[PDB]
Design a protein around this nucleic acid. Structure first.
Lengths: 216, 121, 251, 345, 217, 121, 107
RNA sequence: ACGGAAACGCUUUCUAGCUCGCUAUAAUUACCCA
């Protein structure tokens, strides 16, 4: 068979997220580090490169039994899952991390929210001379959702990695429920929460009855 | 008045035309108007100019007249900001807000005002 | 480790060697010098320059003259040596040819292990865009960087690049982020970006330390000179000078 | 650890009012027992509209009525029998000496400036109050800071220099910011029923008279103790808080000979501890530089309310007696004369 | 292996904190200096950025042997907790400081509180001519609590330095009650406590019971 | 009535329309209205202006209903504030409080009144 | 009329090194969301193919049912896909074979 | 019986790392108006 499987999920923000964007020289008093927004709707967009590369750099610590000097040196548990540039059979690596374009806006404007991107203020104080240095950085608002989805494709090339990859990706989702996923994380941004990890086999003879009993 | 191309020179010689520290020549040719009496005005136009690219024009038109409230108000406190709005035709250009585009253009004019205000000393 | 892993390809062309050969000396005089001996001597001089002497200008510099001669030089190599080799080739060609017969080179940057007939085509495209500029031009890294050579080596590679290099060598606050923002303000450049740059330089003016502060003050005085110069002959020059400096200090 | 804490405790010899700006106006309280009542006037109006007489409430508020015992909303709440007293609010006791020569007027007062209260409804004293009180003492009792707190040749007797004390980043120097090393914390919220609404009482100079004023600010009941956490981290401001025990008595001594002399000491209080002046009504000399604002402070008042000649008129109050702290009859207190003691913990 | 532990504290205020708000469309005779705010519910929250930048200087007053003159010059006991911008292996900082949210909305409605902020008039009395210059700086109310989350890392590069930095982190927890969490500082505005410490490993295999000795003691 | 685009101008041409001091001819044409008697008007509104953002208007309407009586009462205490509330129709605008956005619009209109009074004299 | 300046956006990107932890930024140019493109696919029917023509039309349709589940582009494992067809009809163009056997299977 | 048939400019890559909205600041001053 050929089994493409779609992982419907709800990225709900808490401690609202900022992904970087155009640090091309913006206006004077305006936002210094603006968020990347989808140019049709101007809602915040969490692109798939942040998700895939962040889950790459976080599953580095989990499933690379050896220390990895670079993402080419990922093991053959992650090279088949996130792609690899120098491996023989692990190019085109089976996971299309689709984006999310701020799914709810009829809900988030039903709550009395002016704009979906707050402009939180920040500065820095040097320890010597204590000079201030202010900045206005853009973030998405707190209780947003994000209709995020994966595409895992099973081409009968594996035939044994049915659940050898979902214990990896589900615990990566747990990592992202703990770690920040995007932007100035160590100041406490991002903090996505993954809700309703709904897998559905959009192509293939396959059941989720052995899948969502682990993915909860 | 303010178009798409002429406003930067307007803001330039609306910074030049402003009168400075003539008495008490301790670092003279310095403005009686303080920079914190300009940045407290431009912090309105910046929160318009970057929340204009998200929204409509016709959703912003509550804050747009509040700009004309606060420019009148801060012009009424110090004589320097009243001098500023006489040199720099701010309230006469707040009637010229008809869309998103001319609002962003006026905010670029306000940024040019603060830029050339910081430029001279 | 300072410098970027590039390889630049220059394709010169003598500007109308067909017209300098066919008519040439016949512009002067009443046909008194419209002879065969002068044309043979001139073409043997072009042969002796473009077929012998390029191995003198390329001697210490690290490159490969793939093809040379007549009215074409296709020389691949490393980009500092390629730029310096074009500099020395024209600055001794106008000593060789008295400033007459200005050469119209085109130098493109290309990454490591990119194919060459893909690369010779783009080099030829930059070459013909430099050809049609005027009688002569250099085209550097893209057809929108098209200057006269008399404007390129004197203003960029002698005046501006050394000021830019010395200004960033003898200080360590303003690293590469400031250079990148200066390049972007040089590249976008509407009327409002001159105000944004007048804010930027003045905001950084009182932010540098008091010791090496007037270096920044004379540099912003010397920078706002060419940025707001109202000519566009002294602006893309400065953007290319900053691009050359960034490529020279690439980590 | 270089953080040298202290602890300032503040007894209330005097009525002490601070802050909060807002007030309850003339037709905005209830005096039917011996306790003043301030409900929520929006809650009161929205419950009174169920009694449907609110249109008369429109005419009651604009009612220019003499014999003001019927003016202050007791007449609205006894003439039309709305006397529930369930309105959300806080009750306080009366002074007793609140009005002079006004029989049956224990309720015909007009304006009560609020004391500062947090969102809980329990009043406290903020540390900005004590720090503003401290800055005048520590400005007047140091001779290097008393010379040029003056015009700067900028306007018409405008303001302080504000530069005699180190202030701000000062880009190119160390971290100076001297008053940041006096971290005057806010007091703990005490009991609600320690408020008296003392009247401002002017005692005129060159006129032996005690003409009172129609502004009864809610002050603090006398002889109550207040806690204050004060920490120090720089040695110079640390030495200033150490030398407070000399500078307070020194400022009060040089302020007595500058101002409090020629005035009779019967109404003037006694110290009995470390004396200090807190806010809202203690005279501008307790809030400024006394040997620097001779003709500079009083120059602004060229109006219907000019300070008599040069220097302010003495300000007193009227509040009942415990323990004496008054040192005369008729209960003329001093409106802001507080006591403190200090000890490093 | 790779574990990841969680430090949960309750920032209970005493005379709470003004961290400068966002909107400039403020007022005339109202708030002209608001507190930072979660814009979906307008709650005053404590961001993790002020926590990180306060703890940076508060622990650099203790653990720096050298004077700073700059960031990215900390004494490498902090530069693995708060990160360098310059050191080659210490670009990261392994401490995540999540934004503390105001938790006890339920108990503070039992207390007679109208709204979860306040307006505190804080004028500037001119030291000559006695004229006033008012400001209304808005602060969180006196006894709110905040869910100060924290997340610490454990890799195959932290053999014993998991417990080396804990008494460096706890130095920040009992020196935050020596300083003022950002605000105006010298008018109160920061005195706090950290109730109900419950430290556990939210990821990876690490012990919670021998871990629980040095935190609250 | 007042909407988003006119409420500055509603408070503009009303302020030139009020009477001034025809007698007391020293610095003449000064307002009978004094600044404290207009800050007593605004300080009622400006607390509800920020209570409106946190709360909801249906949990707020009682205080604006009492603020009606407050503007009546401050009008009932002077010859200028009795004149102000109808020469600038504040009592007309107080009958239309329909949502929280109109409430904040009325508060900004009061701020515009204070600003344009501070702009003159 | 939706309101956009140019139909090509610049998605910024980088490359955080795994040990050095140094970024490496990119300016990847993309074409913006929900742009609808003209797409036409000429199938041609000969007499030999006439057995399994209707079979092959359940492969091209199945070839576009999968292209809405894959990226149809490049660098498409990080998004840049989800490319959804619409108005997927079947007309006829100079050929007398009725498309009414197909249009209910595609649309 | 088309220099034509067969040919995805493609694979990998967190716009990231560091940064207190900070520094000074008694809601106060004056004594009255018919």
């Amino acid at each position: 068979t050929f089994a493409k499987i779609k992982f419907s999920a709800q990225i709900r923000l808490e401690t609202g997220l900022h992904i970087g964007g155009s640090d091309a020289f913006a206006a004077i008093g305006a936002i210094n580090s603006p968020v990347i927004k989808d140019p049709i709707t101007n809602l915040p967009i969490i692109p798939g490169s942040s998700l895939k590369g962040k889950m790459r750099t976080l599953l580095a610590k989990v499933y690379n039994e050896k220390v990895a000097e670079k993402p080419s040196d990922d093991s053959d548990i992650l090279s088949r899952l996130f792609g690899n540039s120098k491996d023989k059979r692990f190019k085109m690596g089976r996971l299309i991390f689709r984006d999310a374009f701020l799914s709810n806006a009829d809900e988030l404007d039903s709550l009395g929210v002016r704009s979906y991107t707050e402009v939180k203020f920040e500065n820095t104080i040097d320890r010597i001379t204590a000079e201030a240095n202010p900045r206005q950085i853009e973030r998405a608002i707190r209780n947003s959702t994000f209709d995020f989805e994966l595409i895992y494709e099973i081409t009968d090339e594996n035939e044994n990695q049915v659940e050898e990859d979902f214990k990896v990706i589900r615990d990566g989702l747990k990592l992202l429920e703990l770690d920040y996923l995007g932007g100035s994380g160590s100041r406490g941004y991002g903090k996505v929460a993954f809700e309703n990890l709904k897998a559905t086999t959009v192509f293939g003879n396959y059941d989720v009855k052995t899948l969502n009993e682990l993915l909860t | 008045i303010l178009t798409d191309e002429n406003y930067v020179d307007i803001a330039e010689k609306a910074i030049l035309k402003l009168e400075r520290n003539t008495r008490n020549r301790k670092n003279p040719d310095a403005f009686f108007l303080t920079t914190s009496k300009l940045r407290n005005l431009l912090s309105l136009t910046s929160t318009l100019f970057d929340e204009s690219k998200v929204k409509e024009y016709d959703a912003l038109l509550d804050r747009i007249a509040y700009l004309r409230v606060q420019f009148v108000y801060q012009a009424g406190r110090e004589i320097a900001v009243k001098d500023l709005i006489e040199k720099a035709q701010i309230l006469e250009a707040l009637k010229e807000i008809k869309d998103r585009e001319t609002l962003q253009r006026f905010c670029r004019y306000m940024e040019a005002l603060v830029a050339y205000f910081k430029f001279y000393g | 480790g300072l410098g970027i892993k590039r390889l630049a390809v220059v394709r010169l062309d003598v500007d109308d060697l067909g017209a300098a050969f066919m008519a040439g000396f016949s512009q002067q005089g009443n046909g008194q010098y419209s002879t065969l001996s002068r044309s043979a001597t001139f073409s043997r001089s072009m042969s002796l320059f473009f077929k012998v002497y390029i191995n003198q200008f390329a001697s210490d510099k690290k490159l490969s003259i793939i093809y040379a001669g007549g009215d074409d030089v296709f020389a691949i190599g490393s980009w500092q040596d390629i730029i310096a080799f074009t500099v020395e080739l024209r600055e001794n060609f106008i000593k060789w040819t008295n400033g007459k017969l200005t050469l119209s080179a085109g130098i493109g940057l290309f990454a490591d292990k990119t194919p060459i007939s893909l690369m010779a085509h783009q080099t030829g495209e930059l070459e013909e865009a430099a050809k049609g500029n005027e009688k002569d031009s250099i085209s550097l890294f893209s057809s929108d960087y098209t200057f006269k050579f008399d404007r390129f080596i004197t203003n960029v590679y002698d005046d501006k690049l050394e000021q830019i290099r010395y200004f960033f060598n003898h200080q360590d606050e303003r690293g590469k982020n400031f250079i990148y923002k200066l390049i972007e303000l040089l590249r976008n450049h509407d009327r409002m970006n001159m105000a944004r740059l007048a804010y930027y330089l003045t905001r950084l003016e009182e932010l540098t330390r008091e010791t090496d502060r007037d270096k920044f003050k004379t540099f912003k005085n010397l920078f706002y000179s060419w940025y707001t110069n109202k000519n566009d002959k002294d602006r893309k020059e400065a953007e290319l000078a900053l691009l050359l400096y960034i490529y020279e200090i690439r980590k | 650890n270089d953080y040298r804490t202290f602890k300032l405790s503040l007894l209330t010899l005097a009525p002490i009012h601070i802050g909060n700006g807002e007030k309850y106006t003339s037709r905005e309280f209830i005096y039917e027992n011996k306790k003043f009542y301030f409900p929520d006037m929006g809650k009161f109006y929205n419950k009174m509209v169920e009694k449907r007489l609110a249109e008369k409430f429109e005419a009651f508020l604009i009612q220019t009525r003499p014999n003001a015992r019927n003016n202050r909303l007791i007449s609205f709440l006894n003439d039309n029998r709305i006397a529930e007293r369930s309105f959300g609010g806080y009750s306080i006791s009366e002074t007793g000496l609140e009005s002079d020569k006004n029989p049956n007027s224990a309720g015909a007062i007009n304006e009560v400036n609020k004391f500062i209260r947090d969102a809980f409804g329990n009043p406290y004293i903020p540390g900005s109050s004590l720090k503003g009180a401290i800055r005048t003492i520590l400005m007047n009792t140091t001779p290097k800071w008393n010379n040029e707190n003056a015009v700067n040749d900028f306007g018409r007797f405008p303001k302080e220099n504000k530069n005699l004390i180190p202030w701000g980043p000062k880009k190119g120097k160390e971290y100076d910011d001297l008053f940041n090393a006096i971290r005057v914390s806010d007091s703990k919220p005490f009991d609600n029923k320690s408020l008296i609404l003392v009247q401002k009482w002017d005692y005129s100079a060159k006129t032996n008279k005690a003409k009172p004023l129609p502004l009864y600010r809610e002050s603090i009941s006398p002889l109550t103790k207040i806690e204050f956490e004060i920490t120090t981290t720089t040695d110079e401001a640390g030495r200033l808080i150490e030398e407070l025990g000399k500078r307070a008595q020194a400022f009060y001594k040089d302020y007595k000979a500058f101002f409090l002399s020629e005035f009779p000491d019967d109404k003037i209080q006694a110290n009995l501890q470390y004396p200090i002046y807190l806010g809202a009504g203690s005279g501008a000399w307790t809030k400024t530089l006394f040997k620097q604002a001779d003709g500079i402070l009083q120059r602004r008042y060229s109006r219907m309310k000019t300070k008599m000649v040069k220097k302010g008129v003495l300000k007193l109050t009227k509040a009942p007696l415990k323990t004496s702290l008054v040192k005369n009859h008729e209960s003329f207190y001093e409106m802001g004369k507080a006591n403190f003691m200090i000890k490093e913990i």
